[PDB]
Assembly symmetry: D5
Homo-oligomer: 191 residues x 10
């Protein structure tokens, strides 16, 4: 492991506004990307995460951030799942691309593929506008991720990108930051 | 990668209530453990994270969860930092053990060692009472982690361990859960 | 390659009468098994093949033969597809097991996994009651297989198993067979 | 294995109209080819297959499809077998080339060579006009193949080559086909 | 390459008195065996050699020697060739076994397989009653072997086996032999 | 093994007309060559073979065929043996070159060297005018070769080279030959 | 090992005059360098050695020699330690660079890294103005090195560099030297 | 490398009081040993080192420490050198064993052998009573080592062995030591 | 290479008093043995060396020393050479065994085989009664060895075996010897 | 190994006329060189050999031959030994170079280094004016070599170089030589 590792390249077929479209990581150059894998279409926590991000999508897009979801399921299954009502555990209409990883290459490239299970864990990745990986969140299967936390992290990374100050534990917009220098730091710590 | 993989074993010297003590992962068997690495003593975000957890430690201990912090610094340096006032970027008295990983073996075993830097990234691990790794959170250097989110995750893993239902995106105590069955799931969805 | 080789072992989660059940190749010992792979749930030729076998299942069961279908899709997707009406390209309720091969291990063991696509081709295998592979039919994706030809082949293998005569090109029940001896063959040829 | 694999190249001596001639797979480019191996000259199912295709050869050649048979036997044996009356288990005059694979190279290249037996199984290959393998049929020794089914498959591959449609289970000329699109498929399925 | 090496074991299906039988090299222990390969059934020199040996078989049997012929052709082709009249280049009925080597293992074990041709050269082997290889004669394709020379060699080997004298160039029964000692040799030479 | 294999190249010191001369296989291009190995100078069968060929040398030279003998003995030993009277088991004057293979390289190249004994078996090779190996005759130690059979083989190979018909079993000059074609063969077989 | 081996190259972050600066071995070309590793900041023998050399730096600088100290600790820790009073086991302000070897590459390149402990032993290296290693002194952890012996060695190497006579056991400035010739040596011995 | 490494074992022929005797490292267990290599007999700095230690040997023996010198020279050369007067660059009688390392194995085991020169550098090793290596001093060829400094080190190691306190820079007997504890160290530092 | 190398074991066929006998190195245990190789029978220096030792054989046997000669020639060639008069460059009757090394294994084991030539150089070996190699003399081809020098060496080795003194340059029986001790040597050198 | 092998190159420091000089094998091109190794300075047989050759150096120089001696001892020990009286086991008066092989490279290149002892055996090499090794004499440690024998060999090699006749066993100047031809040899033998 090294600092400022580029996110691994991916490309594949996604369902975007009900259509099959080719999609690649570099389509998101210039924007932050929340790229997240979920285990399996037609399961349990997975739709709740896709819906949680989808229903709050503008809170990301308004800060130059896009969201893409990915599983090992086919694009046909993705579409069938979109075409399933929420009340039956479907997604209904969704504005987040659903990337298909049938070959498992994308999941393996991101280190999130479970060899025993044939699908991914709940792996979420925050990739900056330069394609550099900034954050990795990996959850075991029974526990969903947090849109609140993902937003906070995106906010924090964008802030430190712009200002060069660093973000303390629990930082949210408006919170104090630190000048990352042995002298400069005392402005924060003495305060 | 497989599911329900054990957290790698570790042992080393920790500073615990101002004294050097031997500490090992298995000391926490039967308890949840938040095990987190931070880059470096006498730096910037790191003290804020140790303090953030330390000052809320009873919120964890009261739910059968302990917290351990680790860096590549020596135990002598850990103790010197504890003995540095908070207003100077020190820790002050701290109730969380500070584990020393001078050899880098613990860091490398957890995949958080930065070869180019000679220290870790901000890697946090939630390990259950059986020693199984449940959650991994890796932040790049300039952005601190969240105690709130860490608590929510411990709560959720504990809840799913006890009930067998699964936790939707953003779950907190009191929130609805899902019966992970194609029929049972509809109690959640079909509202 | 050698003659009379065992069908590779497989086991996995299948949807059977709307429930998830573990299924094994060895569960079919004592019976012929038509074991076929299809590319993908919620596609085009695939449901027509599954439905064709399913709706004609008694033509197999009446001759001690079972049918199992398999794709790389999850068991959750299989059940979703069964729960999709036929008029929407679903399966509807179905009496043949749908085996899930999420890991791809079964498909690769049968040599039908397409590395570039992430799913199988249209590979059908006829396995006898002793677990020996008797017939392999591999179709490219746009052309479906034939239940009628599959039945003919099952009938032909069962017949040659029982009688030890051999079945000419295009043999169907009632057709002439050959005694596989340089002398006996002449009854057929002459 | 991959989507659209070229049929392996072959070349060798064939008996064509009672003469020894060099024959190459590439001689058939521009036309579909039914290329089939049979175990052994002077045996039992084998002549019935050669004769079945031969006597119906114009049903193939009239749809731009040629037919070639191959075994491990020598060209001298092929000729002797052609010169044996059908009533003695010979072929009589035959319009299908009989390719000789004495070295076993062709049979091994097609994966139909039986190491324990020294001859092929009953392996039939449908190769399109571009030299791409479209269909493989492999029978164990005691059961002959079907000219009817071979014709159906050639017809179906030619049809799908020409049209933006796919052929359901059991398709024959005149049968309904499917537009391989999530929306267009419903023209078929709605019935 | 060493002195008094055993003939390589072989076993396979032979045509014997018009039937298929399993035949093994070890079936001939206790007797000399002339074991010869010929290129191909239904060819030219080959039938002349098989017939020359078969028609003179008693010249071998009367001196405790058997004859077996082998090619890469199948047992079915061997029998078809036996059932072909001599006037048509057939064998007619034959009293020497015709061994089949479809797999080529026997030919390769005897070093007579031609990789480029897929059949043997004209390789003849004289094997003694103890299974030891005594003589190897390899002819290129256009020139047949000699039954008379084969008989001379068998006689010579049998004579030297019995008497421990050695056989000069061109020895035939009745010819002078040599006592293989520096002193005893002069009985032969010194006149 | 392949058809029409070149005889391995050799060169070395030979005794020619009582003198040491360097001799090379390529010196015999344009002629057939009977190149034969014999075990050892001053032994038993060996002189009989060298003398048998030497005394009939013109029967070979008359038909554009030369003869060369070879053993592992030195050229000095060869000369001593030539200078030894025939009545003492010597050669007397000899018109066939005696090639020396002290290093064993030529013997090994011809596959006739016996590792246990340190000399060759009785290996004879018929090599055509293009240096192509036509016939190999290997006898175990106690039994001499035949000048008659060697002559017959040279005649047969020269005949088939010239006429492109093939030589049946036991062919001698004046004997019937075969046209190696399925139709042309019947001229011979019909008798 | 061979005669006249160059000191392994090193570069890294050092604390110099209270600030972080990149420092390289080649910055010292043209001068002798006493380059020494110590186990750990905030420990026991270590500050005594750093202080002993630092406080006597002019005894080196006045003979074209510089001194650099190195441990596996970070530069932030080095600076904290400099900012700790001597009476608390700190360094106080200091005039010799403290090089950080967080990655352990420098320590490993010098053969002084202890794999079991995660820090160096007490390894001191005398490097000449051409970058050639002249002297290696390795102490186990509980015993500190000597500034006075180090000065003696630097003085001796400079003297032999200049004069081409050699320095007997215990040589100090003013002591007798030897002409390294079988005949010339007798001026010393006899 | 690791802490508390044993000195590598050695054995060889030494000159001890004018006689050749086998000497082993294990002969010195129970006592400290100053074991030093010197380049070459009959050279320049080398005798001054042997003599410096030899003439002050009682300062070591009286603190339970022995001294052994070693070079690559033979025992015969060692003895010749001992028998050379000091005024001619010899040793005269010497009470320190001179170990011979003709094979270079001992020198190589200690990492002091110069491959280009065929002798050692000036390598000195302080080995404790348990055979553990405590100190290594390696000098380039033109500069002799120090008896004063060697005694200081032996004294310091013996002191820290007995008392568990540690020895500051420049420690000599009578000097202040440090308690190696974060609290106890202040007894030293406060002064 | 080490002190007291055993002579490599050998066994082979030798000519001994005109008969072929198996001879082994171990047959000479308890006696010194002069074991020498010579290039080739029927050559030039070689017979002079065999004759020179043979004619003085009693000078060796009188001091419990045997002599054996070896070349790569066959035992038959050796006997022919014995049976050749000395006036023709033969040996005549000889009392030294002539060992044959047809396979070259003995020569190669003794490191005297010339790969380019197919025979040995002039290598002589003095082997003691315990089978240990004491002396090796290797001459290039044009120069013979010395019986005088060989006797001197055998005498010298026997003397030093018996007395444990050592033999100066040019020692012959009756010459001064040296006590191999730094003190004892002076008895010799003081004169 | 092969005929006319060049002597391995060597270079190193030698004591020549009491001074250290670099010496190289190639310095002796155009002259014969007797190059000999001896075990060790200050020992027993060694000085007797060095003295025996050195004192008779003109018997070599007058026939265009030089002498060089070599051991593993240093040049300093070589000089010390030269500077030691003969009556004390020293060399004294010497005029042949004493080459030092401290690294053992020369000894190893000549195959005379003893791994167990750390010095050479008594290996003497006669190298001709073209640098070709002509003679190797290897003695075990207790037995010195012969100046007289070495002179005989040098004389013989020079004679054969010049005349192209070969030198019988025991040849000395004035002795009969042999013309190395099967005919010419009889001038010597046939008397």
């Amino acid at each position: 492991y090294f600092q400022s590792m580029p996110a691994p390249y991916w490309e594949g077929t996604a369902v975007i506004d009900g259509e099959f479209k080719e999609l690649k990581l570099t389509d998101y150059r210039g924007k932050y990307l929340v790229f997240f894998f979920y285990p399996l279409d037609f399961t349990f926590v997975c739709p709740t995460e896709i819906i949680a991000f989808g229903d709050r999508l503008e809170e990301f897009r308004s800060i130059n951030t896009e969201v893409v979801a990915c599983s090992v399921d086919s694009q046909f299954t993705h579409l069938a799942w979109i075409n399933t009502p929420r009340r039956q555990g479907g997604l209904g209409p969704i504005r987040i691309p659903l990337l298909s990883d049938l070959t498992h290459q994308i999941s393996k490239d991101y280190g999130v593929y479970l060899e025993d299970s044939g699908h991914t864990l709940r792996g979420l990745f925050i990739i900056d506008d330069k394609g550099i990986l900034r954050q990795i969140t990996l959850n075991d299967l029974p526990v969903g991720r947090s849109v609140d936390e993902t937003l906070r992290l995106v906010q924090a990374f964008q802030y430190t990108d712009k200002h060069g100050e660093v973000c303390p534990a629990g930082w949210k917009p408006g919170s104090e930051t630190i000048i990352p220098d042995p002298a400069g730091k005392l402005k924060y710590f003495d305060k």
